[PDB]
């Protein structure tokens with residue numbers, strides 16, 4: 001099934017997943033002509049993000065990314081419903097081209113991108129249910145640039161060699177997920193878009209923080225070399241690299257900014 | 262059949278046109294990391310480009326772009342085969358976001374892009390036969406930016422009002438097509454890629470000139486506003502805008518440059 005390279009790659013997803021050829025698709029390039037300040041974009045509140053170090057949370061290689069399952073007592077507030085967390089995961093490039101963010105800024109890729117997925121729990125029982133309904137999902141995106149070593153991201157990356165292959169699972173002790181977010185979270189871009197992976201449901205309220213975080217070259221190299229899209233016993237192994245979608249046409253959307261300059 | 266917007270937009274091209282989901286797809290981002298000087302990239306010569314002003318050439322709005330039909334005695338000298346001209350056309354954005362080149366440079370769109378399409382007339386009888394064959398096509402691409410008024414581009418643009426709607430046609434008196442090319446045409450990027458429109462055949466030798474040309478603000482606005490994709494008697498007219506493909510992944514490959522400096 002679907003991949004980021006070859007016959008089953010992104011230009012072919014719409015063959016099996018119609019919404020991937022529909023409107024309101026993500027990611028997009030964030031550039032001046034389509035930005036507009038909106039003073040009503042007040043600061044989000046991150047509730048229940050400080051996960052207990054004595055509890056443990058499931059990390060899974062699902063064949064397309066590495067994902068950490070999050071508890072439903074973790075929420076974002078500030079939105080017009082409460083949105084409950086369900087999972088976070090990453091997108092990245094490869095060792096010879098560490099430029100695999102999904103969203104771009106003024107045409108430039110960052111090294112990687114973190115997505116923290118939430119669903120409207122006011123309205124829906126689980127994320128799977130919410131995924132194909134209006135205002136079902138809210139995703140927070142953190143842009144990641146090559147920089148200093150990041151001990152908070154390492155709480156995830158230290159477990160990659162235990163989830164190298166599709167289907168494998170590991171437990172990560174709790175930590176404060178807010179440490180994965182950048183400086184000045186009150187500054188963000190906001191827009192209506194989609195899942196960036198099949199089935200590309202146009203049901204996501206996106207928040208992309210303005211400021212990136214840093215992880216080191218060695219942490220990116222671990223992330224880019226540790227994982228496979230395939231099962232441990234697959235005789236045609238495929239490295240999990242370059243797992244980002246190209247940016248999409250705007251189709252008349254604006255992107256709203258909580259910052260005026 | 263296909264479009265640049267809505268259900269039949271670029272992510273769905275591969276359903277009817279499988280090569281749109283295959284290898285070697287264009288356009289691409291031209292950035293320093295993938296550039297490599299190649300001394301074999303000598304200057305092309307543009308032969309037969311000074312079209313007799315006693316002859317006339319058909320301008321058509323075909324619902325995807327505006328195209329001028331060119332005579333086969335017009336050709337590129339300097340490639341291994343002679344490539345004969347078939348037609349030129351443009352790609353552009355829209356007045357709210359006037360950055361609709363196909364190729365990008367260091368992640369940045371230019372305002373528009375002109376393509377002069379040629380086919381291998383040494384090997385093949387016409388452009389339609391060549392389009393799906395080895396060594397079949399060669400495209401010259403000129404990046405366009407806003408700046409001073411360009412009389413030569415006005416030799417085309419002054420006729421746009423007569424090809425407002427799909428299916429309409431105007432005659433253009435011969436002028437020197439070389440006037441549409443930028444300064445220092447010896448400076449270019451070269452790579453093997455594809456058509457940027459269905460059927461997306463991977464049979465194009467691209468030459469993208471390093472230096473852009475200029476057209477005025479008013480010229481660019483005319484191109485963006487003069488044309489519709491729809492027939493005149495269509496009860497739901499659509500503006501012809503944003504008629505460019507998003508950039509494609511281009512991994513483990515180089516773009517060769519005729520310049521180092």
Ligand SMILES: CC(C)(C)c1cc(C(C)(C)C)cc(S(N)(=O)=O)c1
Nearest residue numbers: 064065089115117139194195196197
């Ligand atoms: C909502 C859910 C269906 C859980 C989802 C999954 C993915 C992956 C994990 C397949 C990458 C990617 C996304 S995305 N990149 O946030 O649109 C969302």
Ligand SMILES: CC(C)(C)c1cc(C(C)(C)C)cc(S(N)(=O)=O)c1
Nearest residue numbers: 325326328350376378400456457458
């Ligand atoms: C539809 C239109 C925009 C006019 C177009 C036509 C062609 C053909 C006819 C050579 C295939 C080629 C291209 S392109 N952008 O040079 O690959 C574009």
Ligand SMILES: [Zn+2]
Nearest residue numbers: 089091115196
């Ligand atoms: Zn994601």
Ligand SMILES: [Zn+2]
Nearest residue numbers: 350352376457
């Ligand atoms: Zn073209």
